[PDB]
RNA sequence: GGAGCCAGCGAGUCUAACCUUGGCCGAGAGGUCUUGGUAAUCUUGUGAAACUCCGUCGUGCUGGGGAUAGAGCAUUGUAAUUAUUGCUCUUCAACGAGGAAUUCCUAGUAAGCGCAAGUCAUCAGCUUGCGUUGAUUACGUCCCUGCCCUUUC
């Protein structure tokens, strides 16, 4: 009986962005290398080739936890201080993971509003925390 | 390079 | 002050040679001892424990901690 | 062949210590951000120095920093009356100096 | 109906509710297992009951533990505090009062603020 | 012994923009005292 | 052990017996000074220096305080660290393991003979000056403040990080070497004590 | 240093002002600092790098002086130098690289080597010989 | 009016420098409406709000 | 321009003579007006 | 006529107070705080540092306290002054106009803390006197007769100047010198209740933008 | 080579300058033998102190 | 630079346009279509910050510092090319722990961090409240200083 909650948070997010990068299915949009991913940030991401695939491993996770969530709620807990007044993140990346890993299947829209974890990606990432508990 | 007995510049 | 930025053939023979003796491995001490930037130490130390010449105890991100085999 | 000490690079000195990012910052019009975006066109691993770099790597970027627009660049990221007001305050000055 | 008892553990505004019932050793905050508990550096403040009674205790019994409010640091001794109240109650109220008896005088040998709440 | 000069000023004053902000400072406050 | 719940060995180990971050046992730990025996406190083992305990109610509560609680809370100063007290434990842990790196003796076994080393036995009091005994109690308190101000000012401004430091002051301490900075104010202040004696 | 702008105490040039200040202008004689400073840095012990000037001013300010600095030569570029100074606490160099003259907490001592021999000049005191002095004195100690 | 927070109120219009509104502290003004009010305190910035 | 509430009053001399020769009146003949136990 | 909430121990227990500030005080309003306490014989300043108002009012009712004060400050400048009264209030509420600290004078001594003589003049209205009587009420009861200290509050167009003297007599005549400090204190909020009680009714409350206010005279 | 010895009376009124407390030990190698000495730091009775020199006694320090 | 990630005090739209979830567009700021709430019901678990883990950097006035300045993309009015408040890029100063001196401070106290409302005085990057992390030392003395009490001596 495995799950996502009996896996790391770190552990899991790290196997399942390798996983998304190996399957190569996952839409990433061209403004990626060109994106400061919030107005607080003062650099772009370093790791540019990865970062896009961890934030959808990211979104997917919280989606597994919290049954419904929309762009603003994870615009909030992406966002960090720049006094310093808690600017909020990037609304564009986030909206496009959604889509993304509504397209791969792993989310879907939900009813009530927001995005649900799809049934299919339940398994899948399932899937994923039974590989990282070996 | 200052020496002996010369003294700091004056503007 | 100036530390060596490049891994040089003598240098990398170097670090092969003396890192054993050592009791306690740092990036402070290679730092300090084989005037190597952090940098390379870093990238030194997750080499040199690929090939077992020094044992992890204690990692974390921002201090790591070996010993020699 | 032998790392580059130090190198020249649009009539500007570069040391070859540092990072590519943070040595071409020091070339005026050029920042972190933007020099990150210069070399990440230029297809240049960010983590080696600036004395590494051949001569191919270098042409490119002064390619692309000399042509921005050219290499898609974007063009959101890419670049009398003090004394008036002076003697306006003298007169104010002087006025309420009358009426004290 | 399954035999469970109630307890609650509190430190500033962290309050963690404990429900511990008759089992298999399932231990869970927040509805994830207790090894994941962060911050990491305290995660042997949260696994102290554990250890001192030993887990044979708990190889019969779940427990599941709730917590909100406060910071990090009050939520874990929350936690310890709620698991140690949950444990004491089930020993109490479905196990022999001398079992009671030396899993509190190990506690309070310990550490008191495991059973007594400390309001500052 | 390596020699360096010391940097200092013939006179020393304890710009102009500076020098208005100053007077505007002044004129706020004697303003304020003949309004009270 | 099998629980529902999984849980690592070294937790089982743990069960066998309470151990400083599961990894330094309190048993054969010794105050070598015996003055100091009833106020350098380590009976009573721990696995985490975080208690949260209320030591400033009486006069002498502080004394009952584990030493490596009291340690955690001296190395928090400056402002910048004030209120930090997790990178406080964090960077203790990192120190015990450079301490048994270094040498083999068991740390708990180093801090306490550094901080019995170091302690100044004797200093001066305003009248001119002149000598005067002092309490067990400052002994440990000087101890801990030098040893931490040592160690902190020693990295200040230098590639070493506070744990690295505070171990070679440790472990400089308990030799007795000069090198440490906590000696040779020691030896200052009990030199200048026996100048005014 | 004293507002009319500032400018250092002179015993000749200023008499008025330092006598509403109430002090005795025969102790207001900055020139004789100025000649044992100018003797004293460019003593061939300077140009080896074998001696460091301290200055301990009658109202409590110590100002220690780097080696490597240049005073001027003349009196008034020196008096424009000691007010800069004193107003703001240091010097810095012409190419800016560092401070060559600095105001200093008291006391002397925690600045002073750790062994070290300390003596005045006194001319009630016995006379002696500087050359035999320095000779029978330890190596690893200063003077 | 431009920015309102209940009894208090943010003003423009009324001078056009910080100068203006330095005298006119504590001046009796009230609305249209005939709601009194009281000029509290010129703000640095823009000049004349 | 009008004013719509009282002025900040100012401690001037005047005001601090008539103060004191107030209290001093007062105490001349011991005039306190204290509280006195029950 | 001593109020009610004073009258059933008007006279019979000295005074309990507690001096406090707002969180985060500047150093100015610890150290206004701090001669607030010398003025008050019975006063203990206590760091007001993450308490909470339910929490300060409950713990100071255990403890048996009289009075509460509470000052706020604005850039290091105390601006104003509130006593709350235990178990049931009045909470009246005064901003502080003018206000010299002694910390201004240099060489200035020690004050004395002896029972002071209390005057206050000038109060005619019946606001004045529930004025009066909470502000006397703050002092211990039955003065010495040879008591050197005498503690002042002249009320004048409804701003009551508070000063601090100690007299000596001589043959022709008293001398008086002024230990400070020196500020100007209006009532602006009269309530029945405790500073926590933020429903508590109110007794009296100044009017600012009633056209007669830049005339009219309360106290 | 230190002395140690444990203090057996704290004592008062003996005018000792703030911050110094003159108190009375007995030496742990001869329980009869016994001293006043000064303390610099918060001391109570039945804890041990280090005495470098074991002849001089104590004297009022203003 | 990523990732983990947790509070409480409160406010919020009738003859109106307040707090705003969700969807879409926008690099951001913001725009746009809807939706819940006159409120322990919806905004809101206000997924606050500091903090913790994994990474880059590396004793270099350096990837600390962000004062000053230029050019753009937008909001608010208003009819001016007027300012206004945000965002993007570039520019990158003094400052390397601070003299004589001086002020405050004893437990959820010093200190650090943020969140909310501006509710007739005061306040506008300022006032107040709320919450998060959380110490060292002392808790003894009248020796110095100062202020008192008693001798209904
Ligand atoms: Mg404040
Ligand atoms: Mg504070
Ligand atoms: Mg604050
Ligand atoms: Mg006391």
């Not at chain 11, 502080?96 to 004050?111: E, Y």
Request: with cysteine.
């Amino acid at each position: 009986g495995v799950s996502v909650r009996d896996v790391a948070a770190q552990d899991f997010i790290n196997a399942y962005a390798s996983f998304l990068q190996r399957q190569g299915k996952l839409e990433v949009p061209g403004y990626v290398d060109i994106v400061k991913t919030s107005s607080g940030n003062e650099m772009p991401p370093q790791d540019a080739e990865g970062w896009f695939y961890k934030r959808a491993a990211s979104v997917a996770r919280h989606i597994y936890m919290r049954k419904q969530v929309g762009v603003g709620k994870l615009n909030k807990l992406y966002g960090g201080a720049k006094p310093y007044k808690h600017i909020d993140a990037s609304g564009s990346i986030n909206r496009k993971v959604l889509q993304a890993l509504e397209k791969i299947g792993i989310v879907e829209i939900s009813p009530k509003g927001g995005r649900r974890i799809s049934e299919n990606g339940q398994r899948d990432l399932d899937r994923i925390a039974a590989q990282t508990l070996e | 390079r200052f020496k002996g007995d010369d003294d700091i510049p004056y503007k | 002050a100036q530390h060596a930025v490049i891994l040089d053939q003598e240098k990398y023979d170097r670090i092969l040679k003396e890192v054993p003796t050592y009791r306690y491995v740092s990036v402070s001490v290679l730092v300090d001892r084989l005037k190597i930037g952090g940098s390379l130490a870093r990238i030194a130390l997750r080499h040199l424990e690929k090939e077992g010449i020094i044992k992890p105890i204690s990692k974390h991100s921002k201090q790591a901690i070996y010993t020699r085999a | 062949g032998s790392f580059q000490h130090i190198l020249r690079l649009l009539n500007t000195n570069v040391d070859g210590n540092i990072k590519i990012v943070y040595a071409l910052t020091t070339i005026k019009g050029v920042g972190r951000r933007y020099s990150n975006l210069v070399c990440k066109k230029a297809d240049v691993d960010l983590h080696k120095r600036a004395g590494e770099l051949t001569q191919e790597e270098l042409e490119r970027i002064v390619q692309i920093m000399q042509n921005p627009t050219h290499y898609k660049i974007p063009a959101w990221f890419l670049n009398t009356l003090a004394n008036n007001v002076e003697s306006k305050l003298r007169d104010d000055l002087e006025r309420l100096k009358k009426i004290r | 109906a399954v035999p469970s008892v109630q307890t609650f553990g509190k430190k500033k505004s962290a309050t963690a509710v404990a429900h511990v019932k008759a089992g298999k050793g399932l231990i869970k905050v927040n509805g994830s297992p207790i090894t994941l508990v962060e911050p990491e550096i305290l995660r042997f403040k949260v696994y102290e009951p554990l250890l001192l009674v030993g887990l044979d205790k708990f190889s019969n019994i779940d427990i599941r533990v709730r917590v909100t409010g406060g910071g990090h640091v009050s939520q874990v001794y929350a936690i310890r505090q709620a698991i140690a109240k949950g444990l004491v109650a089930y020993h109490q109220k479905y196990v022999d009062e001398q079992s009671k008896n030396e899993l509190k005088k190990a506690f309070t040998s310990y550490d008191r603020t495991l059973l007594i709440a400390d309001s500052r | 012994i390596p020699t360096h000069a010391p940097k200092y000023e013939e006179n020393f004053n304890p710009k102009m923009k500076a020098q208005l902000k100053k007077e505007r400072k002044f004129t706020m406050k004697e303003i304020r005292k003949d309004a009270k | 052990v099998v629980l529902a719940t999984p849980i690592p060995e070294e937790v089982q180990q743990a069960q066998t017996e309470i151990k400083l971050f599961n990894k330094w046992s309190f048993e054969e730990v010794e105050v070598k000074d015996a003055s100091l025996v009833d106020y350098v406190q380590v009976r009573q083992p721990i696995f985490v220096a975080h208690t949260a305990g209320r030591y400033a109610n009486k006069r002498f509560r502080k004394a009952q305080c584990p030493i490596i609680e009291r340690l955690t809370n001296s190395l928090m100063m400056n402002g910048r660290n004030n209120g930090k007290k997790l990178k406080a434990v964090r960077i203790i842990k990192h120190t015990l393991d450079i301490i048994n790196v270094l040498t083999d003796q068991n740390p708990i076994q180093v801090v306490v003979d550094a901080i019995t080393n170091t302690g100044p036995r004797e200093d001066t009091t305003r009248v001119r000056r002149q000598a005067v005994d002092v309490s067990p109690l400052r002994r440990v308190n000087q101890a801990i403040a030098l040893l931490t101000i040592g160690a902190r000012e020693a990295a200040f401004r230098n590639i070493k990080t506070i744990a690295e430091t505070l171990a070679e002051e440790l472990i400089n301490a308990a030799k007795g070497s000069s090198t440490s900075y906590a000696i040779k104010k020691k030896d200052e202040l009990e030199r200048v004590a026996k100048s005014n004696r | 240093t004293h507002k009319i702008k500032y400018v250092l105490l002179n015993c000749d040039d200023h008499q008025g002002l330092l006598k509403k200040m109430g002090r005795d202008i025969s102790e207001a004689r900055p020139d004789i600092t100025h000649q044992c400073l100018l003797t004293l840095l460019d003593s061939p012990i300077n140009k080896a790098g074998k001696l460091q000037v301290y200055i301990q001013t009658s109202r409590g300010i110590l100002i220690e002086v780097n080696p490597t600095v240049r005073i001027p030569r003349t009196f008034k570029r020196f008096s424009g130098l000691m007010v800069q100074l004193l107003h703001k606490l240091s010097i810095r160099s012409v190419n800016s690289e560092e401070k060559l003259l600095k105001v200093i907490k008291n006391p002397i001592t925690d600045h002073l080597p750790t062994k070290c021999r300390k003596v005045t000049l006194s001319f009630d005191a016995p006379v002696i010989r500087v050359q035999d002095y320095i000779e029978k004195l330890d190596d690893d100690e200063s003077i | 009016p431009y920015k309102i927070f209940k009894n208090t109120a943010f003003i423009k219009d009324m001078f056009s420098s910080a100068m203006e509104v330095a005298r006119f502290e504590g001046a009796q003004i009230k609305t249209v409406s005939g709601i009194r009010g009281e000029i509290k305190r010129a703000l640095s910035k823009p000049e004349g709000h | 321009f009008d004013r719509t509430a009282k002025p900040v009053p100012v401690i001037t001399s005047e005001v601090t003579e008539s103060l004191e020769d107030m209290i001093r009146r007062r105490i001349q003949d011991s005039n306190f007006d204290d509280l006195q136990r029950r | 006529q001593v109020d009610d909430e004073y009258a059933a121990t008007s006279g019979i227990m000295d005074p309990r107070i507690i001096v406090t500030t707002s969180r985060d005080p500047s150093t100015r309003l610890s150290q206004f705080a701090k001669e607030i306490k010398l003025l008050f014989p019975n006063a203990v300043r206590l760091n007001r540092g993450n308490y909470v108002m339910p929490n300060l009012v409950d713990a100071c009712k255990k403890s048996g306290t009289t009075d509460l004060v509470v000052l706020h400050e604005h850039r290091g400048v105390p601006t104003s002054l509130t006593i709350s009264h235990f178990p049931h209030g009045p909470t009246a509420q005064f901003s502080l106009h003018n206000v010299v600290m002694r910390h201004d004078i240099i060489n200035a001594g020690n004050q004395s803390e002896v029972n002071p003589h209390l005057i206050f003049d000038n109060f005619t209205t019946a606001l004045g006197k529930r004025v009066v009587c909470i502000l006397k009420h703050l002092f211990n009861a039955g003065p010495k007769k040879d008591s050197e200290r005498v503690i002042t509050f002249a009320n004048r167009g409804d701003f009551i100047s508070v000063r601090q003297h100690v007299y000596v007599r001589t043959r022709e005549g008293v001398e008086i010198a002024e230990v400070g400090p020196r500020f100007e204190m209006r009532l602006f909020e009269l309530r029945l209740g405790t500073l926590e009680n933020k429903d508590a009714d109110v007794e009296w409350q100044l009017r600012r933008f009633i056209r007669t206010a830049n005339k009219k005279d309360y106290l | 080579p230190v002395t140690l010895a444990k203090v057996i009376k704290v004592l008062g009124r003996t005018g000792s300058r703030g911050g110094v407390t003159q108190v009375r030990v007995e030496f742990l190698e001869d329980t009869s033998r016994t001293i006043v000495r000064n303390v610099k730091g918060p001391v109570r009775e039945n804890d041990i102190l280090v005495l470098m020199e074991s002849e001089r006694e104590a004297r009022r320090l203003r």
